[PDB]
Amino acid sequence: KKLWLENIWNIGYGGFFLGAFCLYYGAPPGHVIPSQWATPKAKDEYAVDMKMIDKYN
Amino acid sequence: KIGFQWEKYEAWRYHPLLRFNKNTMFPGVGLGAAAFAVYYVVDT
Amino acid sequence: NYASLKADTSMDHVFGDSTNKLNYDFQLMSSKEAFFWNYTLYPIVGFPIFLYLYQFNKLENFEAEIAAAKAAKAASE
Amino acid sequence: ADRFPPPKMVATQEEMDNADIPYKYRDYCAHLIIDFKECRYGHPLTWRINCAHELHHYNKCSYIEFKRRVAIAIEEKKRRGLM
Amino acid sequence: VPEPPYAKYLANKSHYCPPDFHYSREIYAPYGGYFNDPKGWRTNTAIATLVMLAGAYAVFCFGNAREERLRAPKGWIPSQLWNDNVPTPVDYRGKVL
Amino acid sequence: AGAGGPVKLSPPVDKPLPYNYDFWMDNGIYPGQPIYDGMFGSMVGNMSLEYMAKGWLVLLPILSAPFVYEHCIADDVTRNPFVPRQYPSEVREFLALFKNGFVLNDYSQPDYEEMKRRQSGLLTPIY
Amino acid sequence: HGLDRDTVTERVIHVAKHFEKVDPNKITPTATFEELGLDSLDTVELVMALEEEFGLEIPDNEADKITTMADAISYVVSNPLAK
Amino acid sequence: SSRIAGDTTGKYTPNIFSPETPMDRSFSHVPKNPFWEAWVFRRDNIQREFVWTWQTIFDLATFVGGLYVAMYATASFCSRQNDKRNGYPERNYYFSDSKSNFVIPDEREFY
Amino acid sequence: ASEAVLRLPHKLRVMRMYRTGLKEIVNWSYGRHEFYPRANALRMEFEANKELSDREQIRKLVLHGEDLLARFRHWEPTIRSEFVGGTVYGVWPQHCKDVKFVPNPAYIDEFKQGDTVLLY
Amino acid sequence: MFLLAVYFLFFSAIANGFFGRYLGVRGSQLLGPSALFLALLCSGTIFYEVCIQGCSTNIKLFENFVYSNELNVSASFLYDPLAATMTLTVVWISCAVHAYQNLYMRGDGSQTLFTSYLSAFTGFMLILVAGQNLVMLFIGWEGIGVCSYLLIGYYGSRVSAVKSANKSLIVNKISDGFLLGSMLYLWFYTGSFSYCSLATFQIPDVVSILVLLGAIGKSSQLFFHVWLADAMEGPTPVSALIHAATLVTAGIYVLCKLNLHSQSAVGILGAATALMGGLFGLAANDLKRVIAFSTCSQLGYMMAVLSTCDDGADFAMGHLVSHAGFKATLFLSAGLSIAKENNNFLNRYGSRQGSPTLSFATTIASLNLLGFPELGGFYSKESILNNAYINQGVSIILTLATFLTAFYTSKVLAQLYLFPYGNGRQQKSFDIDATTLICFGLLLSEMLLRIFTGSSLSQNMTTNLPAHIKNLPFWVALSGALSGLATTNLFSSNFMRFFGNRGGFDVFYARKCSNVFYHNAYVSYTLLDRGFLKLY
Ligand SMILES: CCCCCCCCCCCCCCCCCC(=O)O[C@@H](COC(=O)CCCCCCCCCCCCCCC)COP(=O)(O)OCC[N+](C)(C)C
Ligand SMILES: CCCCCCCCCCCCCCCCCC(=O)O[C@@H](COC(=O)CCCCCCCCCCCCCCC)COP(=O)(O)OCC[N+](C)(C)C
Ligand SMILES: CCCCCCCCCCCCCCCCCCCC(=O)O[C@H](COC(=O)CCCCCCCCCCCCCC)COP(=O)(O)OCCN
Ligand SMILES: CCCCCCCCCCCCCCCCCCCC(=O)O[C@H](COC(=O)CCCCCCCCCCCCCC)COP(=O)(O)OCCN
Ligand SMILES: CCCCCCCCCCCC(=O)SCCNC(=O)CCNC(=O)[C@H](O)C(C)(C)COP(=O)(O)O
């Protein structure tokens, strides 16, 4: 016979872990991890900086 | 000689099967030397 | 209730009696000895601290000597 | 040092880089170490027998360089007056 | 002492178990018991080997996708048979192969 | 037989325990041991700390004698009969940069003083 | 393994024969060492020989109490590690 | 003399009147020792044997105060070095008597 | 010499000294071949002074031999593996029976398992 | 392909240690060796691709393992020539040890858990060797440390084994703490944890000292060698892995990967550790202890050579790889001798009929240790001794260590085989299966291949030395071997006793350091929190 808590425990904790997974991966960039949003902008500033430093040399 | 005869009591340690065999320590050294001697003659 | 305080003497012939006891008094190091060893070991542990202090002192002394000489050269001239 | 001038360097930068010769091994014998290295790696297990000419040549060049180093040392020592 | 009723469910002493050695058979360990040798081991090992090969396949796929060789090998490497990102080999002199 | 060997069980405690009884490690087998062997009780080989110190006092000078000569008594010029390996200028300049390098001891070089000061570098980062 | 009395007796008797002074017919399964002619130093050597024969380590207090052929055999039979 | 209390099927009942002892959670409790219990009591209630003696004062001051002093001195040295490294003016620390009001560097300002 | 050795009577003390000396001969030897001459030498050493009757000289001999046997204690005693101080002593100790196992532990009053706060 | 080896070892660990109930003892005797064979095939491919054909590869598993503000590290594996060589050696030795454990551990209750720990141990060693950043190396360093703690203390009902494991854990904690400090210094002033950007031409002395202090832990050097001798409590397969490759080598590997060491310190510390280890091994009477002290001596040689020349790093790694094979062989053969004789003491060994393979493997491993000419150990040791001539101090000590090494090695060989039988007249036997023969075949194959393939590129390069100076290591080794066969006395009883007590480092720690530690704890607790600040 299954314990009283087994169903509730499995549903609640599985729901927590699944929700955490879906939020971490499903969410658009910059919603959960702020660095993900900055990556394209950093590439553009990197391009400008590279050109500028070359001119400086 | 007074005392226990330690060496007579332990005289079984000279058993043929409890002695040192050159072949066990150096199994194929003779074969290796014979092969080297043959090679020497060929190369020379 | 409580465990028995009676020992087992089944293996006393094979492994020896328990009559012999420890000679330790179960007391720790003397206070005088401890002060010496704490004030010896702890500086050894803090070796980086002394290296930093040494270098910093040398740097500050050099800088002060440089300033003093600069002042002297800037006074007459 | 001046009396015993360095030998000409046969190996160029491009060749030493192409043969992946570390900086430490670029010591006037780099061309020979390139030959030895290429032969040793070409024959992974048989280099000891096969690749013996290149090792000999490297060891000879190294010997000449060592003799130069000793000569330089003696000249410097005489200049300082110790011997 | 009369063995308890549950003792029928528990397994016997294995062949590898020394006859003198006594262990409690009721204790459960994930790594296995004192001397193991369960019935059906051959099937379990075959399943294990299959899971190992499947995971090796997945690991091989992942590695091949992530293995970045940025400098040409001196000579031919076995990776060329399976991975297409190997730079064309260049020898010590510099000649391309 | 590795498994199933007889063991002697440590007698149950039957007297008031000392305050620092935590220094004794007893798993229930008869030969209990101190937390650190040699902290108290029988010492291995009947050798005290004083004996070990006297030994180290006898040994230390003989062991240190080779090292003290070359490191302190000897000098760069006299340590070896040759100069450090000679390299082309481009290679040598780069190699001289390494503090833990072997080209910094070339007295013949006109940059010896700078190289020697580089070798005896900073004890700790200035910044 | 609980070694049987007969085997232990035969091997203790075998060991005791080695003393030169002892007469090969006086040593019986139940004989004191004094009657056999063994001194105190001899008894120590005999106990040590017993230690070699059965591959055990006798604690010194028990070894002191061994002074007759009977008690030795009993002690070995009692010991579970005797080989 | 013993019986299985637990029932997997769920039809568990405590036979409080059973002659035979139930194999409940209490079966596996470890037997205590009169001397070990008194040792535990003595160890916990060690404040009773505390006595103010010169040796106790010496030991406390030398290790606790000594460590605290060493730690404060090191932290003060590190703060002084950082101030010199950063180029900031000598900061007004709490116990330092400095005729300067500098505490937090201005982010806008270039030091 | 330890207290237990000292309490022993003269005869037992000399027997113990002989035993310990033989064991130390074994420990310091490199093979069984070395043991036999050394053991005969030890026997002769004890036999030489056995007939001494002067109590003072006997005490001097005993004390000196005890100091020698204390100094020459080996760092590594040669002990059989299965005995105390041996490598295989306690490796897999034989389990005693009468082990208290609680069957079906989670199914004993499953709903009410937990800690309670009792108040007055 | 490169990842596969680590996968196989971690799989074998998870399978044996989590699913051993299903697999069984026989299942672990299959899955372990099978996985290790597959890992050997992968390691061989890696070695050929990277070492022989100069093709380094970087595999980044995932990015942002740690992403707090500026600090950013990724789980990446770079297989460089050092990594390939060490991977190959480690996997070869582990495969042999796994084959060996099938018969040796049959008499042990948890053979599944033992095999699991051995495979996890090998996996963490491969993680340490192949890491591309300092964090991955730390992950491997700690994983081997934990696996050693779980393997030395395998016999829990022995107080000595648990104490030996605690000793290992504490010493390794002190060392990894110094390493963490050095890694923080290197990250702060270079901007990255990757070895490519880690390069610094001039480093402050503090970082060098911290690096050395971190390395001397795993590679048991002087003052930090206490745990190695004690680590003999564990089963023989553990000792072979730790001593031959997994643990002792890590310190050298770290020093060679990042050349931040100082010449003055490494040379003196190494030569001292070589001499002390040889002297300690002279006194030792346990077979397994003598081979541990031999390991200490060899580690001293490898540490010392770094000071001599630029090629010292190559010479050290070459000795490390040559040493792992013969040393593993010595431990496995010692274990089999102990198992067959039920004895750990050199006094009770003697000539007895046995297997030809085991006796030959022991002789050849001992010869490699001794320095017999035209052997892998000889070339790797002469490369060190010949190149150390420039440092007069290091050379003299290392030659003396060569003498002592030869003396104890010859004494051990004489005692185990030439000497007459020394054990009792009792029935003892250990029958060797074909798996053990395969294990010795693998070790002998490694030993043979090492002679043909070599250990360093500069191994046979000429050292411009007079003939008398070049061939002296041989004369010193021969003299020591001859003196060892004669079983002559070299030192007075006072020094023999001193060397048996290992210099009294542990007696110092117990009488002074441990007493101070527990007095600080007494002042901190009894006097203060539970005394002055506790209410009546
Ligand atoms: C009671 C237990 C019984 C069951 C046991 C379970 C067995 C578990 C198996 C162990 C897992 C080992 C795999 C370790 C890698 C972790 C997998 C992972 O994290 O997935 C990564 C994908 O990466 C991988 O898949 C790695 C490949 C795994 C297998 C490759 C080789 C296997 C050998 C193991 C060596 C791994 C060393 C790594 C050390 C850090 C996620 O990708 P990202 O999107 O980049 O995630 C962001 C990163 N971060 C987590 C930091 C937020
Ligand atoms: C990094 C990428 C992949 C990571 C894989 C890591 C390898 C496997 C990790 C499995 C889980 C990690 C920790 C497991 C739980 C820790 C407990 C344990 O390891 O052993 C348990 C029991 O072991 C288990 O049941 C589970 C072990 C399964 C696999 C363990 C492999 C080795 C652990 C790896 C170390 C973890 C690394 C943590 C730090 C890096 C206790 O063993 P003992 O104390 O020695 O007592 C056993 C009885 N006897 C006296 C007879 C020895
Ligand atoms: C090759 C590199 C060097 C490797 C190791 C070198 C170690 C050399 C240091 C020892 C040489 C100098 C020793 C100091 C002079 C002492 C002379 C006699 C000693 C003495 O009388 O008291 C001893 C103090 O312990 C002591 O002597 C402890 C002082 C040691 C200083 C700390 C150095 C670390 C030592 C680690 C290994 C040394 C092991 C042996 C010291 C024993 O004191 P007690 O316990 O009997 O007092 C009673 C308890 N109330
Ligand atoms: C009643 C309660 C107290 C009674 C007993 C107290 C006895 C303790 C007295 C000595 C304790 C340790 C000594 C530290 C203070 C020494 C004198 C303080 C004055 C001072 O700051 O001088 C600095 C000391 O060096 C330093 O910066 C610190 C050096 C010592 C720290 C390392 C020693 C042990 C390491 C263990 C770890 C502890 C620290 C961990 C971070 C160097 O002068 P300055 O150049 O700074 O000029 C600053 C202007 N005076
Ligand atoms: C590894 C180095 C080895 C260590 C060697 C150290 C050993 C020291 C050797 C010197 C010690 C002695 O001489 S200690 C000898 C002391 N001399 C005496 O006691 C004279 C009186 N003799 C008696 O009481 C009995 O004859 C008795 C002898 C008891 C026998 O009893 P039995 O009549 O029933 O056999």
mmCIF file of C-alpha atoms in Angstrom, chain C residues 13-77:
data_model
loop_
_atom_site.group_PDB
_atom_site.id
_atom_site.type_symbol
_atom_site.label_atom_id
_atom_site.label_comp_id
_atom_site.label_asym_id
_atom_site.label_seq_id
_atom_site.Cartn_x
_atom_site.Cartn_y
_atom_site.Cartn_z
ATOM 1 C CA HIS C 13 43.781 -16.335 26.139
ATOM 2 C CA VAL C 14 44.163 -15.723 22.384
ATOM 3 C CA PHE C 15 44.724 -11.955 22.367
ATOM 4 C CA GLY C 16 46.003 -11.104 25.836
ATOM 5 C CA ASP C 17 44.515 -9.719 29.015
ATOM 6 C CA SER C 18 43.043 -6.256 29.489
ATOM 7 C CA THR C 19 44.851 -5.789 32.814
ATOM 8 C CA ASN C 20 47.430 -3.408 31.350
ATOM 9 C CA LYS C 21 46.087 0.142 31.257
ATOM 10 C CA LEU C 22 47.150 3.395 29.654
ATOM 11 C CA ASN C 23 49.624 5.603 31.494
ATOM 12 C CA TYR C 24 48.293 8.903 30.135
ATOM 13 C CA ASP C 25 46.869 11.315 32.705
ATOM 14 C CA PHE C 26 44.452 12.769 30.071
ATOM 15 C CA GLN C 27 45.554 16.384 30.632
ATOM 16 C CA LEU C 28 46.635 18.898 28.027
ATOM 17 C CA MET C 29 49.775 20.944 27.406
ATOM 18 C CA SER C 30 50.991 23.421 30.015
ATOM 19 C CA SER C 31 49.987 27.064 29.648
ATOM 20 C CA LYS C 32 53.603 28.244 29.396
ATOM 21 C CA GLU C 33 54.403 25.738 26.640
ATOM 22 C CA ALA C 34 51.202 26.596 24.775
ATOM 23 C CA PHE C 35 51.994 30.319 24.719
ATOM 24 C CA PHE C 36 55.370 29.637 23.101
ATOM 25 C CA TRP C 37 54.016 27.208 20.544
ATOM 26 C CA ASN C 38 51.025 29.383 19.592
ATOM 27 C CA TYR C 39 53.249 32.435 19.164
ATOM 28 C CA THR C 40 55.721 30.364 17.153
ATOM 29 C CA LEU C 41 53.402 28.337 14.897
ATOM 30 C CA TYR C 42 50.930 31.145 14.120
ATOM 31 C CA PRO C 43 53.622 33.455 12.644
ATOM 32 C CA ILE C 44 54.792 30.520 10.507
ATOM 33 C CA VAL C 45 51.194 30.109 9.329
ATOM 34 C CA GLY C 46 51.004 33.803 8.492
ATOM 35 C CA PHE C 47 54.042 33.826 6.228
ATOM 36 C CA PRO C 48 52.305 35.941 3.510
ATOM 37 C CA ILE C 49 51.531 38.658 6.065
ATOM 38 C CA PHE C 50 55.207 39.130 6.896
ATOM 39 C CA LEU C 51 56.231 39.125 3.230
ATOM 40 C CA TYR C 52 53.679 41.841 2.491
ATOM 41 C CA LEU C 53 54.761 43.866 5.524
ATOM 42 C CA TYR C 54 58.425 43.562 4.533
ATOM 43 C CA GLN C 55 57.885 44.632 0.929
ATOM 44 C CA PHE C 56 55.533 47.462 1.899
ATOM 45 C CA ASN C 57 58.011 48.812 4.446
ATOM 46 C CA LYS C 58 60.832 48.656 1.892
ATOM 47 C CA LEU C 59 58.692 50.460 -0.697
ATOM 48 C CA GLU C 60 57.599 53.194 1.714
ATOM 49 C CA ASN C 61 61.158 53.736 2.965
ATOM 50 C CA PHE C 62 62.483 53.979 -0.594
ATOM 51 C CA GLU C 63 59.709 56.408 -1.552
ATOM 52 C CA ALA C 64 60.429 58.588 1.491
ATOM 53 C CA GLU C 65 64.158 58.619 0.719
ATOM 54 C CA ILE C 66 63.391 59.551 -2.899
ATOM 55 C CA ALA C 67 61.181 62.415 -1.728
ATOM 56 C CA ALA C 68 63.858 63.618 0.708
ATOM 57 C CA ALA C 69 66.500 63.651 -2.032
ATOM 58 C CA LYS C 70 64.078 65.328 -4.444
ATOM 59 C CA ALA C 71 63.460 68.070 -1.877
ATOM 60 C CA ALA C 72 67.207 68.545 -1.397
ATOM 61 C CA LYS C 73 67.807 68.795 -5.158
ATOM 62 C CA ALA C 74 64.828 71.161 -5.569
ATOM 63 C CA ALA C 75 65.996 73.472 -2.768
ATOM 64 C CA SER C 76 69.472 74.520 -3.930
ATOM 65 C CA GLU C 77 68.411 74.434 -7.593
#
